[PDB]
Design a protein around this ligand. Structure first.
Ligand SMILES: [Zn+2]
Lengths: 330, 97, 48, 417, 83
RNA sequence: CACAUUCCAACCACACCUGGCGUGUGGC
């Protein structure tokens, strides 16, 4: 009976994680699905269980449209003179009352839809409370590994997914370690995992600097350009707003003190820390650095840039896979 | 042997027991009572009657009904002894061998 | 087929494996009779 | 090749070392599998290994040697020990042991202990000549553990007020009573720093039960001492496990005539854990705590005492109050009159961002006459009489100002005349 | 396997040799718990383990402890067929 | 130092049931 409904709403474990209002909304959906499965005809029904004053009372939704298929839920947009509508849309009736909500199939569908709704609500809640920290480095142990994606736990049943594109090709995972990344995507409507954390994207590098470099975070050394090759090489152009600070001794550190740390965090990724410049020439010279550039050709109609490197420094300006150029193109 | 003695948990607190169990229990009871009476220096006639009762119990366990008084354990029916589990059309030879 | 506590299982395992051959063993009820006679004041014993 | 030599260095050194040793990519494995595979491949070259770790008794009879890298938990690199060694050399929980070890032999999966060389920093020959814990005669604290640095740094005030509010001694029983976000962490860090500086002879250990990982990683590199912790990443089974581990380590060390000082944070988390791992006994009171759910916290706390033959066990745990749930309160309730020394921090003082926020007269130490001298005790009484009529907050500010003018407390005492 | 069967009288020493214990209590089992008595008509240390490879006190229930008796009840952990 | 075992990705082991005995009735 309704006493059983109150006992159910009071005997939940996650009481505030899914409050009485949304509990009774899920129960309304349960009873609506039950009444739908009762009659062979399809009819939308609202319940309004009356959380604290009274019991439930089913109704009959019309879904006012000019169609006639299954007229149990069909009524024209002009039927408003008798039965006291007086509307254009939204005209619903309260004809059928006092259905049964405790038999076998009703209990089964109720339990099923309640499980579904509570798990969905708790997943969406534990993801949404972390959504405010989008674009930050977070800790947390991984849960399970697979050939397509991995799972991470941020504490208090916080499920996060990391897809294969977010993982590095030779990134190493084992249930037990704390793989740290940056939250980048949230989809609170996803049927499954929706907390997306990445480490292959350049923004993580910024966040990496945000947890390592004290210069960044105060907007004194702005991170302007960033291109990546997972596990191979990251080309970053960071500008200096002041004059007495050199990124080769500030962003790089003291003889590879910061660049080495972010490389080990990224799993051995070469990090070319150069200076951003308002001139495309110096920008592309710093992009292919270190090298010896003796040419510059610019074309704004085709947006192309030709750099004839010196004879012999090919492996110094192109190298493996042309990364020194490809990342520059990126 | 214990499992060779029929004793199965019936429906409820009651157990389906064998007729040999009652015999062995009565034998043990009278033996313990006799051992107690021998320590308290009971009168000669009392220990005589106790020995007679223990003899009755052990011969009933051996072959009930042969002494002349077929004692019953339940349902006012003759009890099943060790000799009864061998003789007749219900012993081991006629039924289980 | 009836009494061998360790023969019927062996026979079933042989038959399901396509082996139509038996093992004598010893009937359990015979050991039961041996114990029952032994429970009396009578000693029954198997020789060599 | 020792176990600790790979136990303490960071993961990066392990990476370069295994990459040098010509390994499968070790970056795919856990720290414990890293050390396991490296020790495997080292023994595959023909070296006899040495190792160390704290023993844990299992109910099947055999024991397992854990490290502080796993926070004393089950891992692939745990060293198996037979029950017969536990018999002959008289081993038990808490006995830290170092000696000859080998990788698991053919078909096994855990290291084996060959030859015992050090039992609780002692010869294994005298390890059988030990005194038990419950047979000890406890006492009050007589030796003073001075917490003042004397250098007069800015944060050192939070230590000097210690010597002015609640004295500490070897084997003291201290309870920190404070609401959340009042300044318990910085207080505990200063306590650990001052103890490790002024008393480097006594072993210093800290308990972090259901804490944040950032606090753990900041603690493990701020204090000069081996720390153990357990965040909320793990079930309460891990918390109770590390609880027996640390308490038995302290017990065996004090049995070896050593002074142990444990800083536990927080006892409320530990009580929640003990309550949630204990089965229901049908005895429920307000808050949702079982009646026997508190026997384990009572045991862990009553483990503190001052031994007469030598050594002592000081246990200083922090409790949480004003957390909105009555259950926590009930915990603090049974821990109200159990301790003989308390540090009461009121949120009313911490709300003004004036640190340290310590309630003076609500704090105190029982039988503190045996910890300090006569001059110091008289000056403490005079200071208490001066601070009593005034309130909490600006009176604490008054103490902070009077402490900041002088360099050490000798000048403060002389000025108070 | 074996030759002819021999039957004769049972000497008291022969009975004691056959005996793996002595039943003293006239009780068989308990009402609440269905476990057998200590040394009644249905005993464990006298006849054998009621369950397969599991002692009466539950201390030695694994196959590794199979073959030995306990320290309190003293029941040789084996199959129940020994009963 | 020695005896002796080593508590956990599918799954192997953790299975399945009242003729104790009597009475009554019926059939061959
Ligand atoms: Zn047992």
């Amino acid at each position: 009976m309704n006493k059983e409904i109150l006992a159910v709403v009071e005997a939940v474990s996650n009481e505030k994680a899914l409050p009485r209002e949304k509990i009774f909304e899920a129960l309304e959906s349960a009873l609506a699905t039950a009444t739908k499965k009762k009659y062979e005809q399809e009819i939308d029904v609202r319940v309004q269980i009356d959380r604290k004053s009274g019991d439930f009372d089913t109704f009959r939704r019309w879904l006012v449209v000019d169609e006639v298929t299954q007229p149990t839920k069909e009524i024209t947009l002009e039927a408003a003179r008798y039965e006291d509508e007086s509307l254009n849309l939204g005209d619903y009736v309260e004809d059928q009352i006092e259905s049964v909500t405790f038999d076998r199939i009703t209990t089964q569908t109720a339990k099923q839809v309640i499980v579904q709704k509570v798990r969905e609500a708790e997943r969406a809640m534990v993801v949404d409370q972390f959504r405010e920290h989008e674009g930050e480095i977070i800790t947390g142990v991984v849960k399970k590994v697979n050939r397509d994606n991995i799972s991470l736990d941020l504490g208090n049943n916080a499920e996060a997914v990391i897809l294969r594109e977010d993982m590095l090709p030779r990134e190493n995972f084992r249930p037990g370690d704390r793989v740290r990344g940056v939250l980048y995507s949230v989809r609170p409507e996803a049927r499954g995992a929706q907390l997306f954390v990445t480490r292959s994207k350049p923004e993580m590098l910024i966040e990496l600097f945000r947890i390592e470099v004290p210069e960044i975070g105060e907007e004194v050394i702005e991170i302007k350009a960033a291109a990546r090759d997972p596990g191979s090489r990251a080309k970053i152009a960071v500008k200096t707003n002041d004059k007495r600070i050199d990124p080769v001794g500030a962003c790089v550190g003291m003889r590879g003190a910061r660049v080495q740390a972010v490389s080990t965090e990224l799993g051995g990724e070469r990090i070319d820390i150069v200076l951003w410049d308002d001139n495309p020439a110096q920008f592309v010279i710093n992009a292919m650095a270190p090298a010896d550039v003796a040419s510059i050709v610019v074309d704004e109609d085709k947006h192309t840039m030709d750099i004839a490197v010196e004879a012999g420094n090919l492996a110094q300006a192109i190298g493996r896979n042309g990364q020194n150029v490809r990342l520059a193109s990126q | 042997p214990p499992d060779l003695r029929p004793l199965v948990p019936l429906d409820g607190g009651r157990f389906a027991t064998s007729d040999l169990n009652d015999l062995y229990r009565r034998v043990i009871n009278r033996n313990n009572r006799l051992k107690r009476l021998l320590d308290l220096a009971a009168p000669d006639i009392i220990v005589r009657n106790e020995k007679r009762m223990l003899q009755e119990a052990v011969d009933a366990l051996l072959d009930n009904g042969r002494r002349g008084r077929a004692i019953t354990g339940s349902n006012k029916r003759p009890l099943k002894s060790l000799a009864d589990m061998i003789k007749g059309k219900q012993g081991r030879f006629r039924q289980n061998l | 087929k009836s009494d061998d506590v360790n023969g019927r299982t062996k026979m079933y395992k042989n038959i399901v494996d396509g082996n139509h051959q038996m093992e004598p063993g010893m009937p359990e009820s015979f050991n039961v009779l041996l114990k029952e006679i032994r429970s009396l004041g009578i000693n029954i014993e198997l020789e060599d | 090749m020792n176990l600790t030599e790979l136990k303490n260095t960071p993961v990066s050194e392990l990476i370069t070392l295994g990459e040098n040793m010509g390994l499968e990519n070790l970056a795919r494995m856990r720290k414990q599998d890293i050390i396991f595979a490296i020790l495997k491949q080292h023994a595959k070259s023909g070296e006899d290994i040495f190792g160390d770790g704290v023993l844990e008794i299992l109910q099947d009879g055999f024991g397992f040697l854990r490290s502080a890298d796993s926070s004393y938990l089950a891992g692939p690199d745990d060293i198996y020990v037979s029950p017969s060694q536990i018999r002959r050399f008289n081993l038990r929980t808490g006995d830290t042991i170092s000696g000859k070890i080998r990788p698991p032999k053919e078909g096994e999966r855990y290291f084996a202990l060959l030859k015992v060389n050090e039992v609780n920093f002692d010869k294994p020959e005298n390890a059988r000549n030990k005194i038990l814990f419950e047979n000890l005669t406890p006492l009050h604290a007589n030796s003073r553990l001075r917490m003042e640095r004397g250098n007069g740094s800015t944060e050192d005030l939070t230590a000097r007020v210690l010597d002015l509010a609640s004295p500490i001694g070897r084997g003291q029983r201290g309870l920190i009573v404070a609401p959340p976000k009042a300044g318990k962490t910085m207080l505990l860090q200063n306590i650990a720093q001052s103890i490790a500086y002024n008393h480097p002879d006594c072993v210093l250990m800290v308990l972090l039960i259901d804490e944040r990982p950032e606090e753990v990683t900041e603690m493990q590199r701020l204090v000069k001492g081996e720390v153990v912790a357990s965040t909320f990443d793990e079930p309460a089974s891990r918390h109770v496990q590390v609880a027996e581990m640390v308490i038995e380590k302290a017990k065996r060390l004090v049995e070896h005539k050593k002074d142990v000082i444990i800083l536990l944070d927080s006892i409320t988390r530990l009580a929640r854990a003990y309550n949630t791992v204990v089965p229901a006994s049908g005895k429920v009171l307000t808050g949702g705590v079982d009646a026997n759910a508190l026997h384990r916290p009572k045991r862990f706390f009553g483990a503190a005492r001052n031994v007469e033959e030598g050594g002592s066990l000081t246990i200083i745990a922090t409790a949480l109050i004003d957390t909105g749930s009555k259950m926590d309160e009930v915990i603090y309730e049974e821990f109200k009159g159990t301790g003989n020394m308390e540090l009461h921090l009121s949120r009313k003082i911490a709300e003004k961002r004036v640190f340290p926020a310590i309630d003076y007269n609500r704090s105190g130490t029982r039988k503190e006459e045996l910890l300090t001298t006569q001059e110091e005790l008289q000056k403490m009484w005079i200071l208490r009489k001066i601070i009593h009529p005034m309130g909490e907050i600006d009176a604490m500010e008054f103490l902070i100002n009077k402490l900041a003018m002088t360099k050490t407390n000798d000048d403060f005492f002389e000025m108070m005349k | 396997e074996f030759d002819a069967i021999k039957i004769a009288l049972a000497s008291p020493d022969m009975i004691r040799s056959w005996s793996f214990g002595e039943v003293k209590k006239p009780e068989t089992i308990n009402y609440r718990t269905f476990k057998p008595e200590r040394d009644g008509l249905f005993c464990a240390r006298i006849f054998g383990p009621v369950k397969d490879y599991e002692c009466l006190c539950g201390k030695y229930k694994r196959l590794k402890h199979r073959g030995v008796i306990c320290e309190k009840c003293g029941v040789e952990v084996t199959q129940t067929k020994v009963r």
